[PDB]
Design brief:
The structure is a homodimer of 344-residue chains. Chain A is mainly alpha-helical. Chain A folds into two domains: 140 residues, Beta Polymerase, domain 2, CATH 3.30.460.10; 204 residues, cca-adding enzyme, domain 2 (Orthogonal Bundle), CATH 1.10.3090.10. The first copy, chain A, is 38% helix and 6% strand. The first copy, chain A, has 16 helices and six strands. A six-stranded mixed β-sheet of chain A has the order 3-4-2-1-5-6, with helices on one face. Chains A and B meet through helix 16 of A and helix 16 of B. Chains A, B: Keywords: Acetylation, ATP-binding, Cytoplasm, Disease variant, Disulfide bond, Magnesium, Metal-binding, Mitochondrion, Nucleotide-binding, Nucleotidyltransferase, Nucleus, Phosphoprotein, Retinitis pigmentosa, RNA-binding, Transferase, Transit peptide, tRNA processing.
Chain lengths: 344, 344
């Protein structure tokens, strides 16, 4: 309450237009702060990006305010509602009202995920905690705000979300409150019901994050795999392997997942449940043995030819890309570089 | 006798100076022909290069001929007398008289080792075979002239020479007349006597010719290795390996030999017997464990660094070269290419 935030990163959020936002939201009397990640990020130093603004004003009254000041709002099919986006100077501002529904007691945080994402930030730099979140972070904690019968509390997806953050912030691996880990195990069959493209977005974040190998093992030990698209478990040999192969290079989520794929089909099983996109699918079966094993790497005069040749004869797009991820997965580090300097 | 040899290659030997030679030798009445491999080469297409001319004139009268025509002679120091060398239009022509000692009945092709090399060639394009040689070649034969009772016939070196050509012409490995193969086994203890830098020049040819892996297995199966500087029957496991690693790239003879001898010292054992030069020696121990196993290749972020670094501060010459042959031997085909594009 006496310690205000002011570091350079935060300082710059105040763009040529955020100010105009502020101006407007003030004269019209409507407390507006920034929240969620985009508050913790700031605390951690990383500039927020895709900030999630929060406002006490109802969505109803925002338009009769933006329209008034002639501010273009963007992207419809609201369906939820709540959140709104203005443009201002060509910046875009995802403004969102608080909710139980549209409430107004900054105990919106109560609705929030985990501590870390339950903070608010005045533009003073006045930090609004409410759940020792600032303390959990820094402490590298990551804990929900209703035990874990908040995981079940609708959004069963929380499961994945837990895993995702344990990736952003942790340092060591294994340091898991048995409490929530259990909460997960017990539910999880719930996941079987939350959207599907809504898990893809998260599973992809888990995959291109930290201690993937760990996280996905959990995803199996706790038996979440089945309700998340993942195929037939137990072995996790190939995974671990490919896992240590792609690590460092910037593997595409499917490149990784593909390692826990026994066979093609065992991949459409994923396309059907996640509704992944094209390419996403195509890279999958591409890797999955149609080449995973047969397209080895020479062992004689001028390697990478077997690969290049493919790209040439391929008659199907991104041949290179597909190959490159293969090389990643296959672990051929040196060929990878060579290939990333080749053309036709 | 009616079929004269006529080809583009052969036609070109008649350089702007060979003619001068011909002129003289004809005006001095002394049948001069070209012989040895230079003849078989011509038959096979490859232009001779370092042709071995033969003359009925004694080495004595050659000088009282070249001196007369003010033609400079070179590469003296005995020059294994019988063989002389003039220059003519800056070209060098190794002329040699026939012998039992300085004889003259063109049955100097008795003293010759293998049929293939016992031919002669008139500037006519006439051949004169004498031992169905043109037929052994073309038939890919390679047989001594009159039982390996000739191998023993002095020049125990013939052993190595057999191997070397069996590599030139042959196609497949295995096709060995058991007769001569035995003759080798029986003798060969003899090699222990012939020169030593005289074998190194041949062992190297064997090493950078065709079916090496074979040839050397023979060089052991027939127990020749000991009387040649090669370490006491090792295992050839590593060999076979390294052999298939270097094949294709341009391995240096030592880079290969190093394989079949894996503790330093049995490398000097080679230096002592063959009187190989530095570098050859320095490459030896260099590969030979000096780095063979310890200098692996990364397995993480940007490989080849462990190699580069070595060179960067090796405080010893050719570091690169040495390294490069290692990569060959190590089998890192892709790091080899990369390394051959690097500098400082």
């Amino acid at each position: 309450d006496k310690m205000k935030l002011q570091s350079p990163e935060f300082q710059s959020l105040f763009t040529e237009g955020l100010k105009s936002l502020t101006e407007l939201f003030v004269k019209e009397n409507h407390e507006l702060r920034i929240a969620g990640g985009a508050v913790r990020d700031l605390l951690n130093g990383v500039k927020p990006q895709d900030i999630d603004f929060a406002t006490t004003a109802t969505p109803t009254q925002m338009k009769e305010m933006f329209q008034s000041a002639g501010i273009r709002m963007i992207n419809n099919r609201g369906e939820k509602h709540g959140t709104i986006t203005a443009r201002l100077h060509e910046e875009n501002f995802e403004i969102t009202t608080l909710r139980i529904f549209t409430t107004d007691w900054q105990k919106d945080a109560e609705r929030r995920d985990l501590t870390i994402n339950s903070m608010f930030l005045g533009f003073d730099g006045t930090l609004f905690d409410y759940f020792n979140g600032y303390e959990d972070l820094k402490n590298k904690k990551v804990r929900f705000v209703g035990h874990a019968k908040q995981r079940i509390q609708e959004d069963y997806l929380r499961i994945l979300r837990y895993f995702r953050f344990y990736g952003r912030i942790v340092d060591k691996p294994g340091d898991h409150d048995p409490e929530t880990l259990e909460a997960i195990a017990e539910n999880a069959k719930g996941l079987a019901g939350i959207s599907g493209e809504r898990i893809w977005v998260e599973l992809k974040k888990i995959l291109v994050g930290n201690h993937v190998n760990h996280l996905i093992h959990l995803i199996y030990d706790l038996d979440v795999a089945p309700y998340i698209g993942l195929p037939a478990n137990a072995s996790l040999e190939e995974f671990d392997k490919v896992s240590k192969n792609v690590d460092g290079f910037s593997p595409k989520p499917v490149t990784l997942l593909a390692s826990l794929f026994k066979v093609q089909d065992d991949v459409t099983k994923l396309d059907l449940r996640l509704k992944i996109a094209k390419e996403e699918k195509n890279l999958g079966l591409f890797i999955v043995k149609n080449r995973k094993d047969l397209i080895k790497a020479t062992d004689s005069s001028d390697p990478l030819k077997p690969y290049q040749d493919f790209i040439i004869d391929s008659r199907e797009p991104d041949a290179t890309t597909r190959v490159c991820e293969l090389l990643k997965y296959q672990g051929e580090h040196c060929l990878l570089k060579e290939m990333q300097q080749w053309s036709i």
